[PDB]
Amino acid sequence: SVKLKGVYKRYPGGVTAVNDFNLDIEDKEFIILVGPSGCGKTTTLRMVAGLEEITEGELYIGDKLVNDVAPKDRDIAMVFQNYALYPHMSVFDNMAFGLPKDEIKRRVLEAAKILDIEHLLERKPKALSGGQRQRVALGRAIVRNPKVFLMDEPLSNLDAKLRVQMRTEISKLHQRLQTTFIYVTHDQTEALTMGTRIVVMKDGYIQQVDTPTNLYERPCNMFVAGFIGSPQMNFVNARIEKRGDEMHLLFGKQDIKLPEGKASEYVGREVVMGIRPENIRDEEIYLESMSENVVEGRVEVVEMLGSETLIYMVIDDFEFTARVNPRSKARPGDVIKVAFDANKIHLFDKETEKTIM
Amino acid sequence: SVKLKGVYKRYPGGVTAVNDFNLDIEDKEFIILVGPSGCGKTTTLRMVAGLEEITEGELYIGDKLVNDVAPKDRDIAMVFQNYALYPHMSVFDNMAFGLKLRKVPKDEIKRRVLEAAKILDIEHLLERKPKALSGGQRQRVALGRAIVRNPKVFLMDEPLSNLDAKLRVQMRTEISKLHQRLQTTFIYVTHDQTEALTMGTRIVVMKDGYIQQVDTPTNLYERPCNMFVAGFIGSPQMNFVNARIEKRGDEMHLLFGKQDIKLPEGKSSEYVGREVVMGIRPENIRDEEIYLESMSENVVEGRVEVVEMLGSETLIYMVIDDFEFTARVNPRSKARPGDVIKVAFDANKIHLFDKETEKTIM
């Protein structure tokens, strides 16, 4: 367990890098820190590790306050992008720096075969490059059985398909040792599967802390909504209008009827509507059931992937991206009848940019 | 335009590698040859290129028979795994070769080489040598020696095999953009299936030497002619179970295990009562509550065992009775291992094959 109570970090010149970071990681938890560059996500990790000092706040590991504890005295394994293995040491010895009980150390180190480095086991760092030397750094930390793991983009020099293989082995390791993990990555796509809870940070402030599913389906503001999930969620200005007992959203000359179950102090007001691509669907089941919420749009580019078909269109004056089932019939220039799934509409304040529900 | 009329190739020992290969490529067309290893796809290219002889049949590039024409007199551009760039020549000279001894247009060779370089954004590499380049750049350079040929056909034998995951996709879309630019016939051979759905005008699926099907990407995907095309194109693989067709009233139902799926009015005779193989793709086993209300008749309970969230999709792996099935649904599903899920089978997208003959009934 690690707790950060009201933690600040200020840079030279008074600039605030991390602003009131409060969060309680329970033990045996996988927490992911995502956010744009300079959002303070990397800074907090260096502070939990003890590489930067904590200007203000408290940091506890278990029960012990460690703000002024040297990194070596925290029982933490760290992998950062300065992994920097020693050039004139074998792969084994470069992973065997756990001070120790030799001849069992080897067993655990050979078990690092999970990283597919067993065929490099007696090599030296210069013969590997890019991805392989980063998997060596991982290995070093992998055999440490610490109280918490701290990882800063440890799979960034690897290629797609091998990064995926090592992400599943990190998750299995957390499932096996059940020690706290704090994982930092630029990629968002690796947050949604790995972490128990995800923390979205922006310009030093944490926007939201929730489970991957909850971040995806209940964002707190337009930023989190437009930061998690790709391609970016579609955004339009819309006016809420009550017609009869129905509640409608109007943007351009188009008309979306919200389902009975939505709402008070925003009726007649103009809001921003948010729908994700996979909720603009063209299969005709939806075009008959959600007939009230079908809109005609002029397709401009289509992209077929085998997993999906992404359709980029323009409705009245606004560009929209849609995700439909693989191998679609749409082509650039035609106008297609898309249905907006009102049950998946997000509504934010135009000024505060936070959600109304 | 390229035509291959009844073309065969047999190996030492009498084994036939290519068996009655027939198809007429229209000019300015992108054709893809896909199939398992040793399906003869590489052999066919080697025969179009002139590197192997044609045992029987007729090859016509343009309007002329070229079975006995040397490759170099065939007006062919080739990017194969043979095309090692010349080690001690600049990429420029490596792109100006062939053109340099096909009746040198010295001035008109610089102009064309640099237009092919500007298309591939390799002009800032014109003075580097192949050993200084990396795999991806030399695959762009190798392509470049072919744009300067202005050929009648381009021949590509797995030219994106030496690349890593992301790079591949980047140079495929560049080829699709490239064919859309030169508007010359392309014949492309690749191992990966995913570009059935991405690259080609028409696709040829080959199996054990035979052409299984020649069709457009959508039609290849949506109307496979046999279980092989059905299970070779599309990922994850299409689900297959043995089922028996049964006529109850004028409805027609399909039964496998304890479950019963009713086909819509429009599916007919001379296969009813017999055991068939059913084929449905994962994106047609789907759990959205829209499906369970319209297609309540064809809702099935299945025990989830593994789920994989990808951001683009959610893959759900389930067992029904003794049978296994996979479904592809929206990115963040709530189904988790141990639960039982209520999936709807989209009857309008079920494929039915002969159990013995293994070819499609419709």
Residue numbers in the entry:
A (entry chain B): 3 to 101, 107 to 270, 276 to 369
B (entry chain A): 3 to 269, 275 to 369
Give the original sentences from the paper that presented this experimental model.
Clostridium thermocellum has extensive potential in lignocellulose biorefineries as an environmentally prominent, thermophilic, cellulolytic bacterium. Previously, five putative sugar transporters, denoted A to D and L and belonging to the ABC transport systems group, were identified in the genome of C. thermocellum, and the solute-binding lipoproteins (SBP) of these ABC transporters were shown to bind different dextrins by isothermal titration calorimetry (ITC) assays. To gain insight into the structural mechanism of the transporter specificities, 11 crystal structures, both alone and in complex with appropriate saccharides, were solved for all 5 putative sugar-binding proteins, thus providing detailed specific interactions between the proteins and the corresponding saccharides. Combined genetic, biophysical, and structural studies have provided solid evidence that transporter A and transporter B are the major glucose and cellodextrin transporters, respectively, among the five potential sugar transporters in C. thermocellum.
